[PDB]
């Protein structure tokens, strides 16, 4: 067995910081993992490799002529602690539909064998501000059963979270795409884990843990590394590890109930 | 004549407050202006309005039948200033293309005569955190030869910026879009304004406006209104007219210059 996750969130929100940190957690625990990068940024496994970012699937299969010329040990890359990364690109700006690459690329996976039963663990990080295209994939197609969305007292993010779960309830009926829990990552704003937990509690989830705002992250990231790798002592690094071991052990996986914008108003007008 | 005007920018950003902001200011200074939604949040008119939303074209469209039913009166709404405004709308999460509302929408105003000699002035409101489908049709389609981009310090409303840029970029041979400016909507760090200075200078462009962060914002929005209407006096709403008088009276609209992920990473290093 291996329990396929995905992270969503609006951008910028830390998608693919707690992504990298959440999985060298992993790793640190003996766990074998892959990362998916599903956004066209394609900077979601550099942190792993230590890189600039990784050539994504659509780059290297439009230099070698077709996706059937890859083989899937030139695109799968191994970093710290033997995590597995592969970047799925997508169409230059005002081409095409941006989620493309992240069918092409999940399919190349499957058909391939990549999805072996040795992995414990895969994690897709997925552009999350619309929910079409290749971005719903993961979700109309059952490719990851265990949705956490990265968010924080924004208004914003919350209203991301929210239109994220009405895309786990409209594909329902079907195989067996679930919410499992809302990740805070801090503002460093007061009652910022009450307000997350509120919404987690109306959405029918939880949240899972609250991350600090730590500038230790932005050190690490600068020298192109996770902070479990950079600073194993920092306590940013024992939070990352407090998430995986949450993540670990989560048993709640539900069909959310997506809240109204009155709901949304009135929580952010409750915490202050 | 009318300016055809469009502001882009991540999500989160301060699109719609510094849209319906600056037309309340071009308002208030005689102008005549026509806000159009492109965002599927759909609330990018309700500080106009004094309203929860507006309903969209989408949803109205649905309740008479077809688009054909619908007659401009119906769907244009008048508020502060005599400002005209309209919603996209799209469709719901994981279903079909988020930004397939756009277009039903502005061919919709297009066909109904929306565009009266009389205006001075539309600004749509646009996603753009993926410049693909009806979210790339302003630029695609020669509908906005003005693109303002909101941003900031954050490296991803930089990209975000950059990203919105290519898309410019590669409609270049067509029609006449042209990138405007950028706006730093400030996150209250120093030397935001610089770096937002020499982000528009490597792009070719230039910072019309640096924005405040002011809690003004928020006590004018809970009250449904913009700070113009709100508090005329307060120093905020001086920068919103600042911003207004200085993209009536901008020339420069440029083919931008698309920088690498070296150069903005080199431009955050930088300015600390
Ligand atoms: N807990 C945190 N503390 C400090 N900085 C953070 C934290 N989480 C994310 N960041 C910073 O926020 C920025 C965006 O995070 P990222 O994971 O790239 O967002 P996304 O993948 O959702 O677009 C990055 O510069 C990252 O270093
Ligand atoms: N200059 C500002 N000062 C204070 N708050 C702001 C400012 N600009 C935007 N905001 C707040 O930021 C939030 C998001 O802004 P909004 O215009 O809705 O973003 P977008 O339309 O880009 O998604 C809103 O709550 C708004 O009140
Ligand atoms: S939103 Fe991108 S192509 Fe449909
Ligand atoms: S990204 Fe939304 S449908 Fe193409
Ligand atoms: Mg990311
Ligand atoms: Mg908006």
Do not use: W
């Not at 970047?87 to 058909?111: D, H, K, Q, Y």
């Not at 999350?128 to 265990?146: H, L, S, T, Y």
């Amino acid at each position: 067995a291996m329990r396929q996750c995905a992270i969503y969130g609006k951008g910028g929100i830390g998608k693919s910081t707690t992504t990298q940190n959440l999985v060298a957690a992993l790793a640190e625990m003996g766990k074998k993992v892959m990362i998916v990068g599903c956004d066209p940024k394609a900077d979601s496994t550099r942190l792993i490799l230590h890189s600039k970012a990784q050539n994504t699937i659509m780059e290297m299969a439009a230099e070698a002529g077709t996706v059937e010329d890859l083989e899937l040990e030139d695109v799968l890359k191994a970093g710290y602690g033997g995590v597995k990364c592969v970047e799925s690109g997508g169409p230059e700006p005002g081409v095409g539909c941006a989620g493309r690459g992240v069918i092409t690329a999940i399919n190349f996976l499957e058909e391939e064998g990549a999805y072996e039963d040795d992995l414990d663990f895969v994690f897709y990080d997925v552009l999350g501000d619309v929910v079409c295209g290749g971005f719903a994939m993961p979700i109309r197609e059952n490719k990851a059963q265990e949705i956490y969305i990265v968010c924080s007292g924004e208004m914003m993010a919350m209203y991301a979270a929210n239109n994220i779960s009405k895309g786990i309830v409209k594909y329902a009926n079907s195989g067996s795409v679930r919410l499992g829990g809302l990740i805070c990552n801090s503002r460093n704003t007061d009652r910022e884990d009450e307000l997350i937990i509120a919404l987690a509690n109306k959405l029918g989830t939880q949240m899972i843990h609250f991350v600090p705002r730590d500038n230790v992250v932005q050190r690490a990231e600068i020298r192109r590394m996770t902070v479990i790798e950079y600073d194993p002592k920092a306590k940013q690094a024992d939070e990352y590890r407090a998430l995986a071991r949450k993540v670990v052990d989560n048993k709640l996986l539900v069909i959310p109930n997506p809240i109204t914008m009155d709901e949304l108003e009135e929580l952010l007008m409750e915490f202050g």
